[PDB]
Structures are given as structure tokens and as C-alpha cells.
């Protein structure tokens, strides 16, 4: 029920602190086989700071329900069997290739 380039609200601190206080929007970037086979998502943060770097991508979504800046430099793998999450929106098609090409630019040997 989760696919690549979905935007989820995820509880990023479920066991500590105030209840449902760190529930943030995250862009899923791993693919369908990876999600279904591992039950982890790879996510980039959608942040409320302004655009500052060429690595930043302004978020555009299909339903307009989430706004912010995708920081492509920070990535994490989250276990969705252990965290509450909710599908909220999804990335516009015309940004998807930019996302994957930014990531590849961090991985290709210098």
C-alpha cells in the first residue's frame, strides 16, 4: 500500500517525548520490490526551511496537500512495521527523475 514517491506522515519519535509530537512529512524513494520485501522505506525529509542549495528541490505534489523543501542530502531507512505512518500525497511525475538523478550524483565515484 506504499509506493515509490509517496509522501507519508511518519512518527519519527514514537517511544520518547510528547505523544505524536514529531510527526513529519517524508518522501519515499525506494521502489516497490524494496518496500514489500523489507517493510522499510527509504525517505528524504520534507523541510520547512527555505531553498538554500542546488541539492534542494521544491516539493510539488499531485493533490497539493504538502508543501516544503526536499533535502536530497539526508536519507534514512525507516521500519514501517514499528512506526505509525499515514499516506498523505505523492510527488508530481515531472520531479521524480530529478530526485533520482540527485541521489545518483552522491553515489557515483568521484
Amino acid at each position: 500500500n506504499i509506493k515509490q514517491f509517496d509522501i507519508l506522515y511518519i512518527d519519527l519519535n514514537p517511544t520518547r517525548g510528547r505523544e505524536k509530537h514529531n510527526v513529519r512529512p517524508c518522501l519515499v524513494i525506494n521502489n516497490q520490490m524494496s518496500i514489500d520485501g523489507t517493510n522499510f522505506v527509504w525517505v528524504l525529509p520534507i523541510t520547512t526551511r527555505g531553498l538554500r542549495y542546488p541539492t534542494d528541490i521544491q516539493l510539488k505534489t499531485k493533490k497539493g496537500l504538502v508543501s516544503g523543501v526536499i533535502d536530497t542530502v539526508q536519507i534514512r531507512a525507516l521500519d514501517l512495521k514499528a512506526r505509525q505512518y499515514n499516506y498523505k500525497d505523492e510527488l508530481q511525475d515531472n520531479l521524480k527523475n530529478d530526485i533520482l538523478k540527485a541521489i545518483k550524483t552522491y553515489l557515483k565515484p568521484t
Binding site: L12, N13, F40, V73, A102, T105
Partner: protein, 32 residues
């Protein structure tokens, strides 16, 4: 201009990303 060119040119000119880690420090479930 392609985004990979723009990123590469940014870093090769001496541009720096200076953010701290975003607010996802905690590990739960199978996360290691």
C-alpha cells in the same frame, strides 16, 4: 541545466552544505 551538473558545479566551486542532521535520530523496531 541538468541537476547533476548544477550539483557538481556547486560543489566544485567550493559550495558547502551546512545543515545539521534532521530530527530523526531515534531508532525503533529493526532499525540499526
Amino acid at each position: 541545466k541538468s541537476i547533476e551538473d548544477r550539483i557538481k558545479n556547486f560543489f566544485q566551486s567550493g559550495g558547502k552544505y551546512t545543515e545539521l542532521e534532521v530530527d530523526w535520530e531515534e531508532r525503533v523496531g529493526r532499525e540499526i
